[PDB]
Amino acid sequence: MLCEIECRALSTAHTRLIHDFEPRDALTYLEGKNIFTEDHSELISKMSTRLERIANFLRIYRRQASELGPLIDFFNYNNQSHLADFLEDYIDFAINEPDLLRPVVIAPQF
């Protein structure tokens, strides 16, 4: 499982994961890095709308991974690096520099 920090990130960066993203694109990369199952990919892969595949990808994902690695190491490869960069920035304004998360990486999207 993740936690409040790693799940708060998937939620904060949600206005964005809706405008450009697709869970079908990540299913192959995750059945692989060992974080899914052949029913998992079935469940998220056959979904009429994308907000469905997205809400199932973010639900299923928060349970399966020991951390938020194999999803930054994916928006990179998928030419959606403007995404994996935002999330890695957010994970950094928490461990090393505390406090700075709310003024810097949280407010500019109110």
Partner: protein
């Protein structure tokens, strides 16, 4: 400012008052809430007398600043408690399970009631992962068991109550904001806001004053009185005040947004919960001058029960804490004061005969063998003869 309203409505939060607002307090209930974000599982208590206006302030404190919802906390859950039965502390959480649940699967709602607590509790903290930093408002807590569970659920919530003792059972730190009686200057504003014959004349000013006195700043009962001004006349206000020191809130009772049309109906509940032996102590505390700073010994005279006359003080402190019925001033000397509002209700609901005997016992113990000092003058009935003759 349109997303809030979506979130407010769905969290079952009432609309804030707009005509008149206790800014300082609303502005003090928002501040303390902002200070608590990183810290998880916290209690904010708005302890105050019956109808002291606590619940309205939570409506406003979550309705003025839009930061509280969206910026500081993602969602709101506002649930009214008012639980007295032992099943109530469990029933509240069943209503807090479906609240937290999705619009989908309210259809598949199971018999959660026929499920054990260890399940309702686990079942809640199992779905609570959906919403992080969730704020819960618990309008009107009377019992303490809820807190016991909540602390087991690592939960953070705002709390409107008339008592404060429950925190002792709790052990995760707490903060507090007391809804005091409406200050004199403030009241005026409240009236003007609601529209009242503007105070202008002397005898009238002196007549408008008397009004507040009886209410002694209780917002709810300051509303319940204002609604008795159909003529919109200060003269009428004088008339009502006169009716009060005789008939009592009963005559001034009226339909109001508040839960209790009559404040005596409210305070009832504050007199039932009261410790039984402690209940007696209070019951004989209706023989003292209203709104007067008066000594402990002078009280030792009417109150039931060696140099353990301190027992009088213990009752007066507990009674002042539970329901904030009483109030004790530490300095210069340990003295309490039966607020007129706290005084009239008891007077009308209790036994005059008890008070009569009570008054007798008072006089006796006094004989014994704003700077009042009856230390050397305990036996001073005439002092409040105006009050005592009433008995």
């Amino acid at each position: 400012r349109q997303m809030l309203d979506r979130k407010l409505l769905l969290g079952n939060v009432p609309k804030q008052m707009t005509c008149y607002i206790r800014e300082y307090h609303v502005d003090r209930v928002i501040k303390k809430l902002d200070e608590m974000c990183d810290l998880d599982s916290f209690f904010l208590f708005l302890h105050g007398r019956a109808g002291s206006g606590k619940s309205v302030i939570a409506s406003q404190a979550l309705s003025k600043s839009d930061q509280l919802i969206g910026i500081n906390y993602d969602s709101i859950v506002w649930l009214k408690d008012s639980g007295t039965a032992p099943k109530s502390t469990f029933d509240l959480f069943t209503d807090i399970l479906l609240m937290l649940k999705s619009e989908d699967d309210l259809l598949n709602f199971p018999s959660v009631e026929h499920v054990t607590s260890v399940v309702l509790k686990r079942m809640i903290c199992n779905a609570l992962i959906d919403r992080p930093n969730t704020l819960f408002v618990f309008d009107d807590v009377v019992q303490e068991e809820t807190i016991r569970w909540a602390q087991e659920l690592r939960l953070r919530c705002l709390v409107t109550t008339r008592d404060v003792e429950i925190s002792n059972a709790a052990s995760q730190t707490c903060e507090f904001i007391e809804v005091t009686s409406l200050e004199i200057d403030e009241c005026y504003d409240f009236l003007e806001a609601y529209g009242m014959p503007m105070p202008v004349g002397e005898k009238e000013e002196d007549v408008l004053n008397k009004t507040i006195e009886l209410s002694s700043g209780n917002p709810a009962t300051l509303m319940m009185f204002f609604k008795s001004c159909e003529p919109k006349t200060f003269e009428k206000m004088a008339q009502l005040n006169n009716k009060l020191e005789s008939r009592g809130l009963v005559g001034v009772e009226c339909i109001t947004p508040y839960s209790y049309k009559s404040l005596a109906m409210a305070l009832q509940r504050c007199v039932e919960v009261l410790s039984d032996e402690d209940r007696s102590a209070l019951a004989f505390a209706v023989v003292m001058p209203p709104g007067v700073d008066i000594p402990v010994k002078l009280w030792s005279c009417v109150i039931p029960v060696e140099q353990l006359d301190d027992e009088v003080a213990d009752r007066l402190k507990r009674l002042s804490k539970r329901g904030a019925l009483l109030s004790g001033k530490r300095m210069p000397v340990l003295t309490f004061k039966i607020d007129h509002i706290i005084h009239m209700f008891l007077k009308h609901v209790v036994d005059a005969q008890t008070i009569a005997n009570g008054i007798s016992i008072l006089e006796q113990r006094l004989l014994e063998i704003t700077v009042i000092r009856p230390e050397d003058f305990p036996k001073f009935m005439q002092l409040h003869q105006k009050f005592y003759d009433s008995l």
